[PDB]
From a paper:
The Alanine-Serine-Cysteine transporter 1 (Asc-1 or SLC7A10) forms a crucial heterodimeric transporter complex with 4F2hc (SLC3A2) through a covalent disulfide bridge. This complex enables the sodium-independent transport of small neutral amino acids, including L-Alanine (L-Ala), Glycine (Gly), and D-Serine (D-Ser), within the central nervous system (CNS). Here, we present cryo-electron microscopy (cryo-EM) structures of the human Asc-1-4F2hc complex in its apo state, D-Ser bound state, and L-Ala bound state, resolved at 3.6 Å, 3.5 Å, and 3.4 Å, respectively. The HAT-specific disulfide bond is found between Cys154 of Asc-1 and Cys211 of 4F2hc.
Overall, both the apo and D-Ser-incubated structures exhibit an inward open conformation, with 12 transmembrane (TM) helices forming the characteristic LeuT-fold. Nevertheless, upon closer examination of the interaction mechanism, significant differences emerge. Apart from the conserved disulfide bond, Asn153 and Gln294 of Asc-1 could form hydrogen bonds with Arg535 and Lys533 of 4F2hc, respectively, in the apo state (inward open Fig. 2b). In the absence of substrate binding, the transporter adopts an inward-facing conformation. When aligning the D-Ser bound structure with the apo state in Asc-1, only a slight movement of TM1a towards the interior is observed. However, upon further comparison between the D-Ser and L-Ala bound structures, or apo and L-Ala bound structures, significant movements are evident in TM1, TM6, and TM8.
Residue numbers in the entry:
A (entry chain A): 163 to 630
B (entry chain B): 42 to 497
């Protein structure tokens, strides 16, 4: 081998090399100090995270109204105990609440007889309700009771004086919050005179017990003025109204309805539903159901769905079902009155194993709404659409962005996406992925151009693109 | 025996439990599958360690895989293994540890949005330069700081285990129930299990280093197998308990969406005192880097002792007796690789090459057993252990090439490129006056620049 001797190296490295090492050592130390300084400078001048808004429990999923327990299960099982076996199914839908009932004792149009503190024995006993809460609580399915004083009569608030009715509601509240309910709902507040004062009082009491209790109000008015006239005093009140009841099959009109309603109220939390106690199918055709369900989940708010909506159940398309409380179809034998009148597409059993079924669309959408940060509390920005299109972006801070395009028309169009209508941090990209489409025939997970995109009639596309 | 046991535990344990859980979870798809992967890795590392111990007690020569492979196969395979050591596992491991140190430091500052890449890379490089200078400065200081680093890492692990025990005592085991533990959010394909195993085997890396020091204990034959039996299952249990504590602390998405598991664990479970423990994990990463530098220098000494590597990589300083050229070379190599990719890809790459080298050496042991049965071996192992290791290694490698082919392919390319340089360096022994003149000129320039001499 070849090397320099220890004594030879000492002689060689003595005269001038010592200065070189000190200069290199000083230079390397100086570079390290500046390198650390640069990182701290970059760290200080770096964009900061946005604070989370600390969402409540009625923010991370839909609500699943249950108008009548008798028709939810059918004959021989219309009881709270029988309902306890359905919570596995509901948790598959991943709803975050049930507007159960109403179940208070009410024979017919009798103010004195009507007692909101006692459960009617037909629906079960108090122990059954308590057992229902624990199973629901263990499954994180918060139960919301309904407290409409008159549900078997024509008028929901009686034709007599309403002051005693108000006291009954307040007495029911303090009792039922003691029981352990996680909210309340009152329907048809049009017939209630000076309803703004009562709503403020009830919301005051409900929020007084805890900060995780909500009050839900429902009225059939379809114009923006009375809705605002009811929300001017109260700001933390979920109000379900027939505001979107009329469809018109026009994307521009729906775009106006949603944008104006948000603009009038600012950006407060809302609840998106087509009525108070009616299903989607009462106002829409068969081909629009897969379209509206995509719109309701992706909009900023808490979607409210009636029972039998995930399957698109209809009462006018199948005889023997009253329009108020259609019988839920659980299987081919769920309607024994008219055998052979039901199919496999109209039952939940026949749609759980079908990827293209309506229920499958519900389950994947409900999953995305319940977990993604953009859909939970992201900002909603809607830009210019086509002649009958409707599109918006769901962005939140640095998290993944979402884009949804809906074609309410019956004629194939093009995207026509226009820039200069989004903030600099939410600018659309040239290429974006594709999560799901309302109809089969599209390649999921395939990045798709955003300038030559074309819309099939009655089609809604959900697309995702991360920060740009 | 107990002192050797502590040596094995200290060498095996390291800042791998702070990087593994996210990668293991992202592929397993469920808590129970992740725990099964952890325990399977903890058993397979025990099997490999036992077989390596048999090999080491068979040949009293020291040097680890390098020496054993040079003995059984020859010069070509030994130099290929040394090439893989100097090029892949040491630099990638150092880069990974530095990157996780930077991530763990910067995560509290930015809890939800990812920190800028430039700041993280700069911080990692600064930590690396500080460690290289510290190791070049002295040796007694270096080992004292290494001991306190080990103290910090064991303190961090003990606090994590204690907090997990306190939380499980009070009754927070919602995720651990079989209804929620086996809540698969994605069907795991065989490649996903293979990649999860590769990610989770990074925590056990370094269990081979006991063979690197085979020449410095008394009565290795008696204590060594018992040392493995006491040590490695204890390490597996410790990792299992740490994963259990992490899972009681969070939820699948609540943990996967985190760039640093331990800091979020501290900030959501420990409370206001959380600030202390990320410092502990950073100190653990410091210790990992220091130990890796020590093993690197010892490996270079062993490599230049035989003569495939140039002699300049084993020279010590005249005063401080430290091999600064190798340290600078590796610092440059890791600084180069760091500014390329991410922790996930680097972990997959280094774990795959780790397993390839382990399988190659184990096959060498099998070949030695078949060819030469007559030599005195103090301990004898039943053939089921090596055949099981061979079949698992084969399945793992085929799964690795099939699932994610780029990293394994490029690693194979780089190790294969070590053959022509070996042939032109060692197998080509008639170098002309030009090559010898260039070699001696570089030698003298290195001597006069670094002020280092050949060890006596
Ligand atoms: C609501 O409750 C608070 C708490 O006592 C009270 O001060 C306030 O006057 C109440 N408002 C109404 C409208 O009852
Ligand atoms: C809404 O309720 C009012 C009150 O009785 C009624 O006059 C009106 O016809 C209802 N409209 C609809 C669309 O139900
Ligand atoms: C909201 O309404 C106000 C008042 O008409 C108008 O000036 C403003 O442009 C509207 N904003 C949007 C986003 O429509
Ligand atoms: C299911 O099949 C029935 C029978 O032909 C049909 O009437 C119905 O439209 C089908 N449903 C869907 C969603 O295609």
């Amino acid at each position: 081998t070849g090397l320099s001797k220890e004594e030879l190296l000492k002689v060689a490295g003595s005269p001038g090399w010592v200065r070189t090492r000190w200069a290199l050592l000083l230079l390397f130390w100086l570079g390290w100090l500046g390198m650390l300084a640069g990182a701290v400078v970059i760290i200080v001048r770096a964009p900061r995270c946005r604070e989370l808004p600390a969402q409540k429990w009625w923010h991370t999923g839909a609500l699943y109204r249950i108008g009548d327990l008798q028709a939810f299960q059918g004959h021989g099982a219309g009881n709270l105990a029988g309902l306890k076996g359905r919570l596995d199914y509901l948790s598959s839908l991943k709803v975050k609440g049930l507007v159960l009932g109403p179940i208070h004792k009410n024979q017919k149009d009798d103010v004195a007889q009507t007692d909101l503190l006692q459960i009617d024995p037909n629906f079960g006993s108090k122990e059954d309700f308590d057992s229902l809460l624990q199973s629901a609580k263990k499954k994180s399915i918060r139960v919301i009771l309904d407290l409409t004083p008159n549900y078997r009569g024509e008028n929901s608030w009686f034709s007599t004086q309403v002051d005693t009715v108000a006291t009954k509601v307040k007495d029911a509240l303090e009792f039922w919050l003691q029981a352990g309910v996680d909210g309340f709902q009152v329907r048809d507040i049009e017939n209630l005179k000076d309803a703004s004062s009562f709503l403020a009082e009830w919301q005051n009491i409900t929020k007084g017990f805890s900060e995780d209790r909500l009050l839900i109000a429902g009225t059939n008015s379809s114009d923006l003025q009375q809705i605002l006239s009811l929300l001017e005093s109260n700001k933390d009140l979920l109000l379900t109204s027939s505001y979107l009841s009329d469809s018109g099959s026009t994307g521009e009109h729906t775009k106006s309805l949603v944008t104006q309603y948000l603009n009038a109220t600012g950006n407060r939390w809302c609840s998106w539903s087509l009525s108070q106690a009616r299903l989607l199918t009462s106002f829409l055709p068969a081909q629009l159901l897969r379209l509206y369900q995509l719109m309701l989940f992706t909009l900023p708010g808490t979607p409210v769905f009636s029972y039998g909506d995930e399957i698109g159940l209809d009462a006018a398309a199948l005889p023997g079902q009253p329009m108020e409380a259609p019988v839920m179809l659980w299987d081919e034998s769920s309607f024994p009155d008219i055998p052979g009148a039901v199919s496999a597409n109209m039952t939940v059993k026949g749609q759980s194993e079908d990827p293209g079924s309506l229920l499958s669309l519900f389950r994947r959408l409900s999953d995305q709404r319940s977990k993604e940060r953009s859909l939970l509390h992201g900002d909603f920005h809607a830009f210019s659409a086509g002649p009958g299109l409707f599109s918006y972006i769901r962005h939140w801070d640095q998290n993944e962005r979402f884009l949804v395009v809906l074609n309410f028309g019956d004629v194939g169009l093009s995207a026509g996406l226009q820039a200069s209508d989004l903030p600099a941090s939410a600018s659309l990209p040239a290429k974006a992925d594709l999560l799901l489409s309302t109809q089969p025939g599209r390649e999921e997970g395939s990045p798709l151009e955003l300038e030559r995109l074309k819309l099939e009639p009655h089609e809604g596309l959900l697309l995702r693109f991360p920060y740009a | 025996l107990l002192s050797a046991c502590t040596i094995i535990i200290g060498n095996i344990i390291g800042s791998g439990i702070f990087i593994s859980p996210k990668g293991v979870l992202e592929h397993s798809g469920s808590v129970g599958l992740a725990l099964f992967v952890w325990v399977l890795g903890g058993g397979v590392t025990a099997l490999g360690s036992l077989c390596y111990a048999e090999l080491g007690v068979a040949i009293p020569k020291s040097g680890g895989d390098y020496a054993y492979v040079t003995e059984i196969f020859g010069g070509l395979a030994g130099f290929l293994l040394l090439w893989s050591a100097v090029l892949i596992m040491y630099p990638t491991s150092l880069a990974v540890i530095s990157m996780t140190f930077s991530n763990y430091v910067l995560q509290p500052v930015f809890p939800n949005c990812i920190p800028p890449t430039t700041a993280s890379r700069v911080l990692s490089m600064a930590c690396l330069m500080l460690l290289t200078w510290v190791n070049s400065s002295s040796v007694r200081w270096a080992t004292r700081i290494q001991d306190m680093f080990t103290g910090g890492k064991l303190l961090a692990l003990s606090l994590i285990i204690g907090v997990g025990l306190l939380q499980i005592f009070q009754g927070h085991f919602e995720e651990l129930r079989p209804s929620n533990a086996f809540a698969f959010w994605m069907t795991p394909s065989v490649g996903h299990l293979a990649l999860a195993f590769l990610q989770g085997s990074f925590a056990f890396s370094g269990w081979n280093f006991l063979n690197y020091v085979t020449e410095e204990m008394v009565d290795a034959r008696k204590n060594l197998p018992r040392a493995i039996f006491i040590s490695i299952p204890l390490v597996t249990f410790v990792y299992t308990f740490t994963n259990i504590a992490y899972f009681t602390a969070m939820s699948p998405q609540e943990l996967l969406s985190s760039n640093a598991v331990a800091v979020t664990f501290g900030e959501k479970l420990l409370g206001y005192f959380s600030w202390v423990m990320p410092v502990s994990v950073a100190l653990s990463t410091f210790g990992g880097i220091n130990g890796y530098l020590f093993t690197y220098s010892r490996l270079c000494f062993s490599g230049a002792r035989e003569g495939h590597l140039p002699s300049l990589l084993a020279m010590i300083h005249v005063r401080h007796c430290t091999p600064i050229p190798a340290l600078l070379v590796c610092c440059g190599a890791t600084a180069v690789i760091m500014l390329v990719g991410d922790t996930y890809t680097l972990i997959n790459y280094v774990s795959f090459i780790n397993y390839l080298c382990y399988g190659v050496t184990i096959l060498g042991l099998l070949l030695l057993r078949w060819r030469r049965p007559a030599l005195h071996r103090p301990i004898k192992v039943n053939l089921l252990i090596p055949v099981a290791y061979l079949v698992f290694w084969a399945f793992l490698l085929v799964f690795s090439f099939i699932s994610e082919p780029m990293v394994c392919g490029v690693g194979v390319i780089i190790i294969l490129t070590g053959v022509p340089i070996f042939f032109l360096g060692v197998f080509w022994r008639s170098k002309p006056k030009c090559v010898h003149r260039l070699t001696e000129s570089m030698t003298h320039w290195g001597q006069e620049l670094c002020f280092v001499v050949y060890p006596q």
